[PDB]
Amino acid sequence: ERSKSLPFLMKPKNLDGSMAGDVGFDPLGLSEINDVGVDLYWLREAELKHCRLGMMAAAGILFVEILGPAPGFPAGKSQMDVFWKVYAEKPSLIGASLAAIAILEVISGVATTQGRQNGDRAPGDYNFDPLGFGKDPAKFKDLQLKEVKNGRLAMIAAAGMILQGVSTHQGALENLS
Amino acid sequence: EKSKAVPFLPRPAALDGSVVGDVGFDPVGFTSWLPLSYLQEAEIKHCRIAMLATLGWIVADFVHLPGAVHEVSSLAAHDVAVKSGALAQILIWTSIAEAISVIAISQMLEGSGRQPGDFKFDPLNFAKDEKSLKKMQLSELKNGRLAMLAFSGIVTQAALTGHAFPYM
Ligand code: CLA
Ligand SMILES: C/C(C=C=C1C(C)(C)C[C@H](O)C[C@@]1(C)O)=C/C=C/C(C)=C/C=C/C=C(C)/C=C/C=C(/C=C/[C@@]12O[C@]1(C)C[C@@H](O)CC2(C)C)CO
Numbered sequence: 458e459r460s461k462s463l464p465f466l467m468k469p470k471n472l473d474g475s476m477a478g479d480v481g482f483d484p485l486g487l488s489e490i491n492d493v494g495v496d497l498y499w500l501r502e503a504e505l506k507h508c509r510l511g512m513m514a515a516a517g518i519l520f521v522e523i524l525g526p527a528p529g530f531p532a533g534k535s536q537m538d539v540f541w542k543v544y545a546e547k548p549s550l551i552g553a554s555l556a557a558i559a560i561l562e563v564i565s566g567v568a569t570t571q572g573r574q575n576g577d578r579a580p581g582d583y584n585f586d587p588l589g590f591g592k593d594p595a596k597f598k599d600l601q602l603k604e605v606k607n608g609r610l611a612m613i614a615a616a617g618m619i620l621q622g623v624s625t626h627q628g629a630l631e632n633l634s
Numbered sequence: 635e636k637s638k639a640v641p642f643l644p645r646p647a648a649l650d651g652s653v654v655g656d657v658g659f660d661p662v663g664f665t666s667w668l669p670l671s672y673l674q675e676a677e678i679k680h681c682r683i684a685m686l687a688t689l690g691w692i693v694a695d696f697v698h699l700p701g702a703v704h705e706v707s708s709l710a711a712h713d714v715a716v717k718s719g720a721l722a723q724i725l726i727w728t729s730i731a732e733a734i735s736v737i738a739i740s741q742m743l744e745g746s747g748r749q750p751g752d753f754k755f756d757p758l759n760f761a762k763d764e765k766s767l768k769k770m771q772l773s774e775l776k777n778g779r780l781a782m783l784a785f786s787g788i789v790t791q792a793a794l795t796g797h798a799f800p801y802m
């Protein structure tokens with residue numbers, strides 16, 4: 458009856474055990490929202506998209522700062538400020554990436570709403586397993602848990618890197634030391 | 635359910651299997667409120683127009699017709715051809731063809747039996763049975779889509795950088 462994460466709180470009604478990373482940590486009861494097209498399905502899809510985006514962004518920042526930029530690309534070690542140097546010399550790359558992300562996000566929203574309507578697609582599912590790393594069950598749950606935990610950690614990390622780069626105008630590991 | 639192209643999206647519910655080049659790609663559901671034959675005709679018309687346009691752009695940046703008016707790049711050829719009246723002739727004959735097309739598409743939508751884009755233009759055969767016709771229709775659709783995207787890229791690159799045939 459009590460949430461596993463917060464023993465002083467009752468179990469959130471909509472979070473039983475199903476989703477990976479579920480420990481009952483919903484103090485504000487946001488999982489019970491059923492308005493403005495927002496429900497547990499939409500919240501989970503948003504959480505998974507945030508997890509994946511944060512993982513990609515944190516990996517990119519760390520890669521560029523440690524191993525350096527790719528040939529022909531600007532340096533500076535400040536990832537929040539090197540973006541304007543890339544846009545100053547290769548605006549077409551940024552524009553094409555933005556257009557591609559826009560199209561993919563329109564497709565993602567359509568897929569999310571459709572799967573919410575005629576329930577056949579789990580939240581965050583895009584059938585993207587080209588290498589077959591999660592075919593069999595009893596490993597899919599473990600992979601989902603790993604992805605969720607890594608994505609939450611990378612969300613926090615990427616938000617921290619964004620704020621550090623905006624404020625200190627220095628690199629992430631530069632702030633570290 | 636679970637359209638072939640986008641495996642996580644539902645089938646567009648208007649494209650089951652009985653159209654050439656039908657991989658179930660309609661995420662925004664254009665076929666849900668527009669006739670399928672109308673959209674097919676529009677797509678095939680775009681394919682043919684853009685194939686001709688890409689070939690003409692690339693060729694005219696290499697080979698020029700005799701005369702001083704034909705000595706401009708394809709990027710600047712529009713303002714020269716419109717002034718000389720060269721594009722007026724193309725406009726006149728294209729308008730004639732498109733009025734006949736108005737009649738044809740109206741008849742196709744109101745029964746008839748004319749397949750979308752089927753003008754029966756076939757001096758040579760190149761398509762003897764149903765299988766050959768289907769294969770060549772798929773080839774035409776794929777080549778036309780590729781040429782539409784290719785002309786888009788060619789025009790955008792040439793406008794961005796006023797370069798010759800290599801528009802990099
Ligand atoms: C979308 C189709 C299209 C359009 C609008 C244009 C437009 C133009 N072309 Mg052009 N061209 C095209 C296709 C096209 N071309 C193709 C496919 C080729 C390859 C043979 C060429 C080869 C070409 C050359 C070599 C030159 C031009 C030039 C020009 C410019 C002025 C003279 C002229 O009209 O061309 C004259 C066109 C030709 C001599 C060949 C056209 C052959 C046609 C397109 C193929 C048969 C299709 C058939 C007749 C369709 C019937 C239509 C129906 C309604 C009845 C003008 C901007 C001239 C210029 O100023 O260059 C900058 C020039 O020197 N074009
Ligand atoms: C209606 C809609 C879409 C939809 C739909 C459909 C289509 C109807 C389908 C469904 O049926 C429903 C629904 C709702 O899904 C809404 C669209 C979404 C919006 C409104 C898009 C918002 C995106 C904004 C982002 C993601 C911007 C991020 C900015 C960053 C800046 C980066 C910086 O580097 C910059 C530039 C400068 C640097 O110095 C430092 C920083 C600041 C870090 C980080 O990235």
Ligand SMILES: CC(/C=C/C=C(C)/C=C/[C@@]12O[C@]1(C)C[C@@H](O)CC2(C)C)=C\C=C\C=C(C)\C=C\C=C(C)\C=C\[C@@]12O[C@]1(C)C[C@@H](O)CC2(C)C
Nearest residue numbers: 548549550551552553554556557775776777779780783794
């Ligand atoms: C949109 C795009 C790029 C957009 C870039 C933009 C907006 C950038 C704009 C800017 O930089 C400028 C210009 C100047 C700056 O000052 C301002 C900004 C704004 C910064 C590229 C698309 C590029 C699109 C591309 C490359 C498409 C390739 C498509 C292929 C290969 C298709 C293949 C098929 O069609 C066939 C062949 C057969 C079919 O049946 C099957 C498939 C597979 C679908």
